[PDB]
Amino acid sequence: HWGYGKHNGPEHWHKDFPIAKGERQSPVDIDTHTAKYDPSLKPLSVSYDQATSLRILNNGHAFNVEFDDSQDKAVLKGGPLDGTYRLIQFHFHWGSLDGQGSEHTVDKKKYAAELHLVHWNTKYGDFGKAVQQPDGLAVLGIFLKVGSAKPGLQKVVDVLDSIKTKGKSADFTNFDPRGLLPESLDYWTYPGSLTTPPLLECVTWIVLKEPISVSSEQVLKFRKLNFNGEGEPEELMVDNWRPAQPLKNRQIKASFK
Template sequence: MSESWGYGVDNGPVHWADKFPVAKDGRRQSPIEIKNAETKHDPALTELILSYDPSTAKSLVNNGHSVQVDFDDSEERSVLSGGPIQGKYRLRQFHLHWGARDGHGSEHVVDGQAYSAELHLVHWNADKYESFELAAQAPDGLAVIGVFLQVAKHNPALKRLISSLDCVQEKCLRIEFNDFNPHTLLPPSLQFWTYLGSLTTPPLYESVIWIVLKDPIHISKEQIARFRTLQFTGPDHLMKDNFRPPQPLNNREVLRNFQ
């Protein structure tokens, strides 16, 4: 990824349009504020089907912008189907965004409420495109599930991920991270909102079918504090507030699969 962007005063989201014009000119940028009363129930939206093979988990990396778990997507082994998407989308990676303090840090906002963090599970349309890179530039190329994290209580499903953060404190550090099922990070209910949007980081391609889960998962104060010990570029530049603010809706329709 380009070094020309980040989350600092000089290279943060307000400056992204300088190098990525779609940030200013795009009509389907993400994230957004979801106003539930203005969303539309769509009875045609089917349930999400997540079929994840834990053996496809490969590695954990600090990419300088977030911490990310990469998956083997060379075959159709960890896939998402149903909901608003056609066919099967392969899981490529998941990563998180979080704030410097509890109560803010999520990218999507619901009825004025932000959460302390947001998990993104990134899938790509391998039925239609030959590679993730090609899919990432196509209008129906990606499907991302967004999961809110609410500071409340200890979440045992996050224990292994968080205990591994010490090994990837610095940018570009990568370790093996095998046999992990991301389904354990999802809430029991998969009710969702969905809309057409974009990547929330440069190059901000408008290629994402967003699926934002209504129910958050829990995380403890101690657990989320561990994410804030990661480094963007050094010990004097800790990784926090790595989120993009909501973008204009531009008359887009936001659908929901619940009454």
């Protein structure tokens, strides 16, 4: 159905998902000179000590590392958020070359990739209910630039050969997502949407200012994945990012001066 090619990519999504042209779509460009410091914003609380990763899945658009979200084990709170949001999965968006790949941009700069740690508001009971609410999800976004290797990413990189094609999964227990964070939790925040269909306007976005560095070899392995299923013509999983969407009547707030 939808995808990232010329015939089914982001410019086509509105025909099946008319919210694609909505009032709070993501991603957006973060204009750093226009984002206002909000001293009312609290420090983020990232509590991943008890995270329970389970499985890694190639879903035909990215790969997801899935977590046990049946209890409050890995949660995001504070910052702009009211209440408690449970980690359900993380995934990335990346490019065919290092000069593109991120979904959010910073003063129009594109990073090589972007990590999304996806959390749902426990007041709605399950993820499917949460996505129907304007405050249902919180996605923590982290930019990736190419330079030195990220040691905490290597366990992900090394399993990708086992999930090359759409629909393949592999056991992925005991992975610590704290190894994917940068040092600083300074962030920008704004109300937005899922960046893939169904594009629901249910996300509080929290985008960290500090990128993580990954090595060229690490991102090259991302680019060896396939959008296609096994025994189908090979289409490399690259450029699985949606471009920036109109900001409309929204303000991006900064946690830092």
